[PDB]
């Protein structure tokens with residue numbers, strides 16, 4: 526096949542998509558699985574003044590494989606407003622609705638030259654891109670596998686299970702992984718006992734990202 | 750009919766269930782709609798030392814209608830652990846799984862003496878109570894209407910829409926209402942433009958709690 530494609534979404538913004546994407550791509554690359562990081566849509570950015578956006582961090586990592594990459598090669602719709610993409614686009618660029626057909630082509634083009642194409646979304650699954658499409662719709666159009674990153678705090682059970690319900694209702698392969706931050710041991714006392722129970726009772730277990738680099742690489746590359 | 754029953758859930762813990770429940774019950778009572786507040790299950794509490802739990806706040810309000818009420822009349826499963834109820838119960842009271850049949854009877858008994866029985870859950874909809882039942886399952890067994898309180902911050906679109914998807918997939922009447930806190934005007938700039946669009950395109954609109962006391966009272970009391 527051409528390269529595999531893995532969409533990275535989350536319970537919400539700030540959960541750890543970028544952090545986990547970079548860790549996974551680094552592991553894959555170290556294993557000989559040539560992996561690019563893409564951030565097709567990004568809000569809340571000012572590229573004239575700030576070079577620490579998700580796309581900029583991705584670009585730094587990506588240039589270890591291709592010096593010629595520039596920001597515009599890996600991120601295509603970028604907005605100042607710290608909001609959902611649909612709103613940002615309507616306010617800042619009212620004449621150019623985000624074109625997910627175009628994005629699909631651009632993202633798939635990287636499957637020629639990479640073993641794995643990692644595509645970070647923005648926010649969570651139900652975040653609107655156009656009037657008709659959210660992040661999950663975009664992932665579905667891409668025919669990507671899904672990795673959904675959860676936060677590690679009180680409330681994660683609800684947030685993971687809401688996403689499980691939405692994902693299991695659609696036609697895609699997915700994993701939910703908790704981004705367990707350093708210094709958090711309340712997680713193991715408070716939330717892990719339920720994850721444990723859930724996993725004994727579910728065909729598709731919720732995993733801890735930091736325990737799961739190998740498993741998630743296997744997941745991303747499996748099958749067609 | 751006997752009194753109506755309104756379950757109050759949320760996007761997650763700390764969104765504003767208790768705050769909004771109390772405001773709604775106060776408005777209803779002021780309108781002549783005799784309304785009780787119940788918190789059947791509560792975690793993270795130590796009643797020997799602290800009298801500011803949700804049930805305690807409810808009790809204060811409720812005693813304006815019935816001096817004889819005590820905490821045990823309005824809250825039935827109470828745990829120290831700051832966790833989902835299932836986990837708290839398994840750790841603190843392993844021989845007594847939460848009995849939702851019992852709770853259903855106790856809550857419905859109040860429909861004899863009140864026009865409206867408000868039942869606050871714990872956390873969000875997918876929070877586990879028993880191995881087989883979550884908060885939404887409990888609301889379904891109760892045959893209550895649902896009011897789902899959202900937070901007012903960046904990310905609310907995703908959280909509201911995840912809940913919309915789950916709720917619209919089940920057989921109950923529901924409203925989603927944003928708890929818009931004082932001093933937040935970023936909401937109107939950042940999130941409201943999407944709520945506006947969503948409402949033009951949906952049969953069941955997302956409302957702002959503080960704008961909606963009358964509407965939500967009408968909702969709670971409508972029909973059988």
Ligand SMILES: Nc1nc2c(ncn2[C@@H]2O[C@H](COP(=O)(O)OP(=O)(O)O)[C@@H](O)[C@H]2O)c(=O)[nH]1
Nearest residue numbers: 535537538539540541542543544545705706707
């Ligand atoms: N202290 C700490 N911060 C983290 C960790 N993982 C992510 N973060 C921080 O959390 C914030 C959000 O992470 P990010 O990966 O950008 O999340 P995204 O918005 O979902 O892509 C950033 O400031 C990260 O540096 C961690 O393990 N420890």
Ligand SMILES: Nc1nc2c(ncn2[C@@H]2O[C@H](COP(=O)(O)OP(=O)(O)O)[C@@H](O)[C@H]2O)c(=O)[nH]1
Nearest residue numbers: 759761762763764765766767768769929930931
């Ligand atoms: N400053 C401020 N705090 C609020 C408001 N609404 C709720 N809170 C606080 O948010 C916290 C969580 O609210 P609560 O109603 O208990 O949420 P629940 O856990 O969903 O029942 C409490 O400390 C409240 O006092 C508000 O409008 N302004």
Ligand SMILES: NCCCCCCCC(=O)O
Nearest residue numbers: 680681682683832833872
């Ligand atoms: N204030 C006590 C709140 C208990 C919240 C339980 C949240 C469980 C989860 O969804 O992870």
Ligand SMILES: NCCCCCCCC(=O)O
Nearest residue numbers: 608609648904905906907
């Ligand atoms: N860091 C830019 C993050 C943009 C997050 C958009 C969240 C929209 C919502 O679900 O309310």
Ligand SMILES: [Mg+2]
Nearest residue numbers: 538539540543
């Ligand atoms: Mg971010």
Ligand SMILES: [Mg+2]
Nearest residue numbers: 542543579645
């Ligand atoms: Mg990110």
Ligand SMILES: [Mg+2]
Nearest residue numbers: 762763764767
């Ligand atoms: Mg609370």
Ligand SMILES: [Mg+2]
Nearest residue numbers: 766767803869
């Ligand atoms: Mg509460």
